[PDB]
Design a protein around this nucleic acid. Structure first.
Ligand SMILES: [Cl-]
Ligand code: NA
Ligand code: NA
Ligand code: NA
Lengths: 216, 460
DNA sequence: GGGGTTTTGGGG
DNA sequence: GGGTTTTGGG
DNA sequence: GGGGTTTTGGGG
């Protein structure tokens, strides 16, 4: 049984084509998690891995209401509780976003969270980027594999096998290796993007706007 | 410069002392804050290497060297145990019972590494030859000087090391934990196992398949840049690892930025024994082939022994640079790893065609054996780590008409329309080859712009 | 000039 | 020092 | 004091 809440959640989301509805509802309960960092990157840990929660304009506001004196960009070392959250899939550039993998990011959209001030959480292993976990990385690769395999089986047709006479008795025959490259789908650029999961999207605040909005 | 032996160095002088020593263990240079990097290592010499052998069971005795610096590039990267280090201006003191040499590299101290073996790890990787048996393969500061009177200390200690590493374990049983007990550890521990497999997870990550003397098999992610010396069949010592309680599909070891994977010098008694003792394991693979989705990678093939010592080339170089790269044009044979996304022709029964060696044409056998010589005309649509994100699939063929790769399937070509036993075996292989996490380690020959598999046999 | 360091103001 | 950075090899 | 560098005798 998976002990890491984040790993189990993010895994079930990916295994269910990024459909937050198909994922078990028994895991949609409040999430109490420690805050490793808060700036320049806000990261929380479920006791095992750290993930970057994306705050909506509503959340950061509601937070300020019941907690005016509380600065979010300073919650480091302090634990927080999320009562209204939703996980959604998003295609990103892993070369810039370190909280993703293979240009795919599973985001934790937080609608509302409370700061459990001074509460002292239990000491656990050193938290790590869930997106650097061997098993979770493989999970995502599986996700892409399925999408890639289906895409190719839909685009490639007619058993257009390389003519054998081209490789048989080819002493005086010379060829360019790029003659073996095959386009997987109709995708625009050189990047494969023929996924079936409906890429969700919700206006989320940049951890920077929450900085100036509290200490310009 | 005067060189003192580890056991003869003063404890009360607190004066800068210099010495030569053999590195048997060391953390990786790591950062502790916004200005300091550290590297701690275990050193030995002819006067400090073994403990009171009566009730010690042949345990290793050593000194500890802690090098402090303000820049990563000022600390020694220890890839292999057995090499020699020369330190200048170190302050010795007793730290919890053991001789602890401290050196503030960010001030006046300095170090230098000398390869005990002919070549240093790096030079071995690049196939480079050492400048001389008196040249450091790495040193702090801009300059390093090897006085004539030192050549003896270096040569002698170099000899002592081999005799030492060959006569003792160096890395005694009290220095590492058994993998089958790794789950019982409270925190981090050390490992000494054989690298059964090096799987390229992605552009910057290797996944080592470890197996030690206890028989347990664990996996761990090893960056390519940080540990470019990992080699299959080799034995290594992992400094600081943690059992991953969150991995259910497979036993995993977690490493930290200060963790280090170290190999051993040729004369290593421990390395030699474990290399021959710890044999390959396929239990994980065999078992994973029974599950719908296996989070465990499975290398379905094995290349002929004659190629075992051949560097692999990625599909990226194979299909996008093989015609423009100077070094990739001189060779026609290559080794590569990839996963099959699709197999053509779709109908498995058409895998074996009839081949008329004359018209060079082939045809279906759905109508007797006259069509000609039976051959495998299979076309694989592959992909790999280096091409993971692109919208391409690469063609790799198994055309055995000329004999190349005629046994890849461990099934001699035959009319699959009539031979049920043959067709069935191939249909099974088809399911494995296209299953996620299944891979192929195969050697290929470049023929008229195409890559045909050869000297590669399925092992499942 | 500025570190580290202890020389705590002055060599080369 | 048997340890935890951002460079998010370190 | 002593590097390394240039400040070339003096800060902290
Ligand atoms: Cl060619
Ligand atoms: Na000074
Ligand atoms: Na000076
Ligand atoms: Na000066």
């Amino acid at each position: 049984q998976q002990q890491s809440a984040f790993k189990q959640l993010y895994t079930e989301l990916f295994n269910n084509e990024g459909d937050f509805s198909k994922v078990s509802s028994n895991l949609k309960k409040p999430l109490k998690c420690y805050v490793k960092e808060s700036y320049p990157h806000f990261l929380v840990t479920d006791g095992y891995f750290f993930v970057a929660p994306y705050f909506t304009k509503e959340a950061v506001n509601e937070f300020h209401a019941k907690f005016p004196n509380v600065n979010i960009v300073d919650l480091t070392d302090k634990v927080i509780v999320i009562n209204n959250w939703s996980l959604e899939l998003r295609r990103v550039n892993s070369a810039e976003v370190f909280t993703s993998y293979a240009n795919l990011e599973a985001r934790l959209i937080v609608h509302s969270f409370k700061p459990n001030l001074q509460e002292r959480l239990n000491p656990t292993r050193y938290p790590v980027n869930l997106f650097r976990d061997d098993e979770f990385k493989t999970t995502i690769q599986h996700f892409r594999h399925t999408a890639l395999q289906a895409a190719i089986n839909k685009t490639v047709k007619g058993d257009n096998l390389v003519d054998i006479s081209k490789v048989a008795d080819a002493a005086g025959k010379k060829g360019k290796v790029d003659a073996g490259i095959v386009k997987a789908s109709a995708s625009k650029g050189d990047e494969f993007s023929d996924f079936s999961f409906k890429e969700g999207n919700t206006a989320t605040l940049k951890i920077a706007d929450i900085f100036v909005q509290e200490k310009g | 410069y005067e060189y003192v032996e580890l056991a003869k160095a003063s404890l009360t002088s607190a004066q800068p002392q210099h010495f030569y020593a053999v590195v048997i263990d060391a953390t990786f240079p790591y950062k502790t804050n916004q200005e300091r990097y550290i590297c701690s290592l275990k050193i030995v010499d002819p006067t400090l290497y073994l403990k009171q052998q009566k009730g010690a069971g042949d345990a290793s005795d050593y000194a500890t060297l802690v090098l402090y610096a303000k820049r990563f590039e000022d600390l020694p990267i220890i890839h292999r145990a057995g090499d020699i280090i020369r330190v200048h201006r170190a302050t010795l003191r007793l730290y919890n019972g053991q001789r602890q040499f401290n050196a503030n590299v960010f001030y006046s101290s300095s170090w230098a590494l000398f390869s005990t073996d002919k070549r240093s790890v790096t030079q071995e990787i690049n196939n480079q030859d050492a400048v001389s048996d008196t040249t450091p393969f790495s040193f702090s500061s801009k300059h390093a000087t090897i006085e004539k009177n030192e050549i003896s200390i270096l040569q002698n200690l170099r000899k002592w090391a081999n005799q030492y590493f060959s006569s003792y374990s160096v890395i005694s049983s009290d220095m590492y934990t058994a993998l089958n007990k790794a789950q019982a550890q409270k925190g981090d521990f050390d490992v000494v196992a054989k690298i059964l497999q090096v799987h390229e997870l992605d552009e910057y990550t290797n996944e080592l398949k470890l197996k030690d003397a206890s028989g347990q098999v664990f996996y761990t992610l090893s960056l390519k840049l940080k540990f470019p010396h990992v080699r299959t069949g080799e034995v290594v010592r992992i400094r600081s690892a943690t059992y991953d309680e969150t991995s259910t599909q497979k036993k995993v070891l977690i490493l930290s930025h200060y963790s280090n994977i170290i190999t051993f010098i040729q004369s290593s008694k421990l390395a030699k024994e474990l290399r021959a003792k710890i044999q390959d394991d396929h239990s994980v693979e065999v078992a994973s082939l029974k599950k719908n989705v296996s989070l465990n990678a499975v290398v379905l093939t094995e290349v002929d022994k004659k190629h075992a010592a051949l560097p692999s080339t990625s599909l990226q170089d194979l299909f996008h640079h093989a015609d423009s790269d100077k070094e990739l044009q001189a060779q026609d044979t290559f080794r590569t790893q990839f996963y099959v996304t699709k197999i053509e022709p779709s109908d498995v029964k058409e895998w074996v065609k009839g081949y008329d060696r004359k018209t060079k044409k082939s045809s279906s056998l759905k109508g007797a054996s006259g069509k000609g010589d039976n051959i495998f005309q299979v076309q694989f649509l592959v992909k790999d780590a280096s091409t993971q994100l692109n919208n391409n699939t690469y063609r790799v063929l198994l055309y055995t008409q000329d004999g190349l790769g005629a046994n890849f399937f461990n099934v001699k070509a035959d009319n699959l329309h009539k031979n049920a036993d043959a067709r069935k075996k191939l249909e099974d292989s088809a399911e494995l080859l296209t299953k996620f996490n299944s891979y192929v380690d195969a050697v290929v020959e470049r023929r008229n712009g195409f890559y045909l598999i050869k000297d590669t046999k399925l092992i499942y």
